[PDB]
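retry 2 of 3: previous attempt timed out while embedding 1YJ. Reduced batch size to 1 and resubmitted. Inputs unchanged:
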Amino acid sequence: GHMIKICIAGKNNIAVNSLQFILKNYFEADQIVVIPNKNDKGIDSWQKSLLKFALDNNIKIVTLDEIYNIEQIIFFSLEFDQIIKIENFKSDRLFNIHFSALPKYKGVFTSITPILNNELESGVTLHRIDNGIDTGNIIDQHCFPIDINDTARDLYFNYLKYGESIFKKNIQTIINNSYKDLKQTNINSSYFSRKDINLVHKINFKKTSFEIHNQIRAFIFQEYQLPIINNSKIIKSILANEFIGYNVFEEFENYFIISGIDGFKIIAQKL
Amino acid sequence: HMIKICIAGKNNIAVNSLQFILKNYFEADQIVVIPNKNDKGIDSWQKSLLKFALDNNIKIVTLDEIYNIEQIIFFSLEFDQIIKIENFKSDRLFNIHFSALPKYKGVFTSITPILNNELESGVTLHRIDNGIDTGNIIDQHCFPIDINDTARDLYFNYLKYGESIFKKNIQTIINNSYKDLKQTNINSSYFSRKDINLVHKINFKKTSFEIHNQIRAFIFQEYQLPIINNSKIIKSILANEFIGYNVFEEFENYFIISGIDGFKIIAQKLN
Ligand SMILES: Cc1cn([C@H]2C[C@H](O)[C@@H](COP(=O)(O)OP(=O)(O)O[C@H]3O[C@H](C)[C@@H](O)[C@H](NC=O)[C@H]3O)O2)c(=O)[nH]c1=O
Ligand SMILES: Cc1cn([C@H]2C[C@H](O)[C@@H](COP(=O)(O)OP(=O)(O)O[C@H]3O[C@H](C)[C@@H](O)[C@H](N)[C@H]3O)O2)c(=O)[nH]c1=O
Ligand SMILES: Nc1nc2c(c(=O)[nH]1)N[C@H](CNc1ccc(C(=O)N[C@@H](CCC(=O)O)C(=O)O)cc1)CN2
Ligand SMILES: Nc1nc2c(c(=O)[nH]1)N[C@H](CNc1ccc(C(=O)N[C@@H](CCC(=O)O)C(=O)O)cc1)CN2
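retry 2 succeeded.
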């Protein structure tokens, strides 16, 4: 019964493209509001800007305060930067797409944490927001491989793609309020906060090849940083099955050859 | 040569496995033993391999004395020395490692799988090569880490399943008719002594599952118990009752704790 039906809060391609899907299939611009993230400067770059799309397309920019009293508003967080408190809202139609295969890897830096912890797969999960961090009941989840030479930046782009997708898969039943959900288990639940990750990663070479490789490629996301070996930035790590002896470490002009305690060949490419 | 087999290592896995060969396969005369450096020659919370051997007129030797024995079966059962295979005339060199290889190579394997959130572990019979726990897998038996198992419980499961896999496989080892498969690069992990601080400092900005896991991974009373506010902890119980996020309350006999997802932990203080 209110004029505003939906708020998209967050950033990057996932937010912008999801918003474009709703504008095309579901709601007119004047039934939509957005809350861009604090660091959104309105500039299209290696990602699309939600603030810029909103301005371009005459969608009103609001704050949380302005939406708390809108009854029945659908609130959708797509890489939103604020932890909400659900008791502020009259609506209970509050959703998030989280970049991991919940209940694993709640929290932040989820293009880093699964790689660093030796996962072969990750996922995106659509869930209701409750007062905890990525703790709410799951509505849908899509799992996908972390390929053996995927970097954190590669995995991030997979989150964006599969996330956008899981949004489109589910938005109808969310708008109809006909969706199903299930509470998260206690077991397998894991969480990382910013203080658990040191973005200047010091590599522990007394590790297997797999682990050394994981350690490198988990911090490859050039827009933010690259890992450093012997004062050289690394742009790609390649892990092979080839046995080359234990604890190999050789610096060349364009790359390092590395093996860990199990002796499998890594090529770490310089930038 | 008269000597057919060396059993090297410690604890009930080594003693019972030796008793089983002495009963079914070889005479005392055909067996030599290398205890670990720390073997006291008395029974304690585990039986002494040194004592068993001396009690049964099985000769105690060093690695030097066996290198030259043609065709000897060398069988490590929690042995404390990394061998170098080119020292030996025989290539019949075997180990039972207490993990589900290729995961959790190295040490402290009753801690590492719990601390890294595993639901299961395993024992793995493999050939020894020059790396640590790297050689080809001959057999493996996987079993659960129950939700409230401690490191101590895990260890006693390794000794039991470890003894069993020895008994299952030993004839084919004697007859050299066993089969094996090289280990994969993927999923391979390793922990060395320096990776684990046996005086664990709990990170409470984690899930209840992780906090519980941190506690119970260090419960091994013969060595240490984890400490919370100066009380030693003997048992951690994780329930799927929601009690609020980030609870911490101390009582006389226990703590009530929840992490970021709010599930109830009871940490029982040692009596
Ligand atoms: C800031 C930063 C990011 N990254 C990489 C890894 C990150 O997973 C990826 C995306 O970073 P970004 O700052 O957008 O967020 P993130 O930590 O993954 O995601 C968290 O922060 C978002 C604002 C929240 O919406 C997310 N909430 C989800 O339910 C949260 O998981 O960029 C670096 O390698 N280095 C960096 O310094
Ligand atoms: C020394 C020590 C051990 N433990 C626990 C954790 C560990 O998994 C278990 C057995 O201790 P260990 O016998 O020192 O063996 P560990 O599991 O480190 O195994 C390692 O050392 C032995 C001697 C090798 O044969 C074995 N292949 C290695 O994996 O006891 C503790 O909790 N605290 C300790 O201080
Ligand atoms: N209610 C609630 N609000 C949400 C989500 C939720 O699922 N629950 N899902 C999204 C979560 N977004 C985040 C998640 C974490 C942080 C964050 O900033 N974490 C800090 C920790 C802050 C703290 O300890 O509380 C850190 O890692 O250092 C910020 C936005 C959006 N809003
Ligand atoms: N060849 C080789 N020898 C072996 C085994 C093997 O599968 N391969 N299997 C058994 C493994 N026993 C161990 C494993 C690790 C240590 C150990 O002492 N590790 C040190 C690291 C030592 C190092 O880096 O050299 C540490 O963690 O600080 C000792 C005995 C017995 N001997």
